[PDB]
Design an enzyme around this catalytic site. Sequence first.
Site, PDB file in Angstrom:
ATOM      1  CG  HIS A  50      -4.520   1.754   3.299  1.00 36.92           C
ATOM      2  ND1 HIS A  50      -5.420   0.717   3.151  1.00 36.92           N
ATOM      3  CD2 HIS A  50      -3.463   1.246   3.974  1.00 36.92           C
ATOM      4  CE1 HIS A  50      -4.921  -0.372   3.711  1.00 36.92           C
ATOM      5  NE2 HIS A  50      -3.737  -0.076   4.222  1.00 36.92           N
ATOM      6  CG  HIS A  70      -8.279   3.459   0.711  1.00 36.79           C
ATOM      7  ND1 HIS A  70      -7.939   2.595   1.732  1.00 36.79           N
ATOM      8  CD2 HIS A  70      -9.467   4.001   1.061  1.00 36.79           C
ATOM      9  CE1 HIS A  70      -8.874   2.626   2.664  1.00 36.79           C
ATOM     10  NE2 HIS A  70      -9.816   3.465   2.277  1.00 36.79           N
ATOM     11  CG  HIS A  83      -1.792  -1.039   1.483  1.00 40.27           C
ATOM     12  ND1 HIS A  83      -2.014  -1.579   2.730  1.00 40.27           N
ATOM     13  CD2 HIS A  83      -2.584  -1.722   0.630  1.00 40.27           C
ATOM     14  CE1 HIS A  83      -2.895  -2.560   2.634  1.00 40.27           C
ATOM     15  NE2 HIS A  83      -3.256  -2.667   1.368  1.00 40.27           N
ATOM     16  NE  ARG A 112       0.714   1.323   9.181  1.00 39.90           N
ATOM     17  CZ  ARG A 112       0.309   2.588   9.191  1.00 39.90           C
ATOM     18  NH1 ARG A 112       1.200   3.597   9.112  1.00 39.90           N
ATOM     19  NH2 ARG A 112      -0.993   2.850   9.301  1.00 39.90           N
ATOM     20  CG  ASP A 135      -6.702   0.270  -1.219  1.00 42.83           C
ATOM     21  OD1 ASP A 135      -6.059   0.517  -0.165  1.00 42.83           O
ATOM     22  OD2 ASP A 135      -7.947   0.329  -1.264  1.00 42.83           O
ATOM     23  CG  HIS A 141       0.533  -3.897   5.552  1.00 45.15           C
ATOM     24  ND1 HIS A 141       0.131  -3.330   6.739  1.00 45.15           N
ATOM     25  CD2 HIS A 141       0.496  -2.904   4.633  1.00 45.15           C
ATOM     26  CE1 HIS A 141      -0.138  -2.049   6.550  1.00 45.15           C
ATOM     27  NE2 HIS A 141       0.084  -1.765   5.282  1.00 45.15           N
ATOM     28  CG  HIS A 185       0.294   3.590   4.566  1.00 45.50           C
ATOM     29  ND1 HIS A 185      -0.417   3.372   5.718  1.00 45.50           N
ATOM     30  CD2 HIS A 185       0.406   2.385   3.957  1.00 45.50           C
ATOM     31  CE1 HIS A 185      -0.742   2.093   5.803  1.00 45.50           C
ATOM     32  NE2 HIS A 185      -0.246   1.470   4.748  1.00 45.50           N
ATOM     33  CG  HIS A 212      -8.987  -1.567   1.942  1.00 45.72           C
ATOM     34  ND1 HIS A 212      -7.742  -1.070   1.621  1.00 45.72           N
ATOM     35  CD2 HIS A 212      -8.876  -2.917   1.904  1.00 45.72           C
ATOM     36  CE1 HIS A 212      -6.914  -2.075   1.395  1.00 45.72           C
ATOM     37  NE2 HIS A 212      -7.577  -3.206   1.561  1.00 45.72           N
TER      38      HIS A 212
HETATM   39 ZN   LIG Z   1      -6.824   0.800   1.463  1.00 42.69          ZN
HETATM   40 ZN   LIG Z   2      -1.323  -0.313   4.679  1.00 42.58          ZN
END
Ligand SMILES: [Zn+2]
Ligand SMILES: [Zn+2]
Lengths: 127, 135
Positions: free
Chosen positions: B62, B74, B45, B125, B77, B114, B47, B70
């Site tokens: 995110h 996003h 992802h 994370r 993503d 992740h 962020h 999600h």
């Molecule tokens: Zn997301």
């Molecule tokens: Zn994330």
Amino acid sequence: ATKAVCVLKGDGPVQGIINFEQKESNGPVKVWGSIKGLTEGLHGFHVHEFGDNTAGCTSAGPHFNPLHVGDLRNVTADKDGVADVSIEDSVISLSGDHCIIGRTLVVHEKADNAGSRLACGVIGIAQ
Amino acid sequence: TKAVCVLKGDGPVQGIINFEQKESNGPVKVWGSIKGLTEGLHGFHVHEFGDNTAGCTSAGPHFNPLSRKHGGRHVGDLRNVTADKDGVADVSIEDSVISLSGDHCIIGRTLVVHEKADDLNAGSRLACGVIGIAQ
Ligand SMILES: [Zn+2]
Ligand SMILES: [Zn+2]
Ligand SMILES: [Zn+2]
């Protein structure tokens, strides 16, 4: 963005956090924070062209100078090796042609001829 | 336009990820590799913040400028990467939602890998880095 941040790290003991804030588009950028692990005295402080840390500071590329923009001059470390930074710069920017987001901030071995890159990091969006 | 990201974190996880976008309204090619992972799926992802002052903890949520749920959505993503039996994940993505310019711009934000699969609940994370402009 109106705020950016950079974590400086290197192979040696030089480490720091530098903040940038530009509340007004195209306005002056406030630069502040602290760097420690430095020899007492002057150190070149520059934005370099690429936010490429794949080879540590060696991959940062040249001084940012889109055809000197990146030349923030010098920071001064005290007897404890700590450089407190508080600068206003009207040439760098957090948007437009002089945008420094995603580029690399570098602290140098000597005053800027500035010698080795002691620590660097990529300039990231903070707000 | 080209970008790069070096992922680092508190254990063996590390990687280098490249980005390229030929046209402002075109897809972004995302490629590189991540090592030190458990075999199988890992959430991947962008962020919101390029703030690595507290390692990956300070990267924010995110990246979601359009305030969507999600998916994989996003903007940030990028679904999942898959690590082999040696813990190496090859990355080869073309994504049309992220950009290297405009409001979906991810330069200066944080790429994070992740602990667990993104269910498209990704967990901790493991490694991250700020996305930078590249040559
Ligand atoms: Zn997301
Ligand atoms: Zn994330
Ligand atoms: Zn320099």
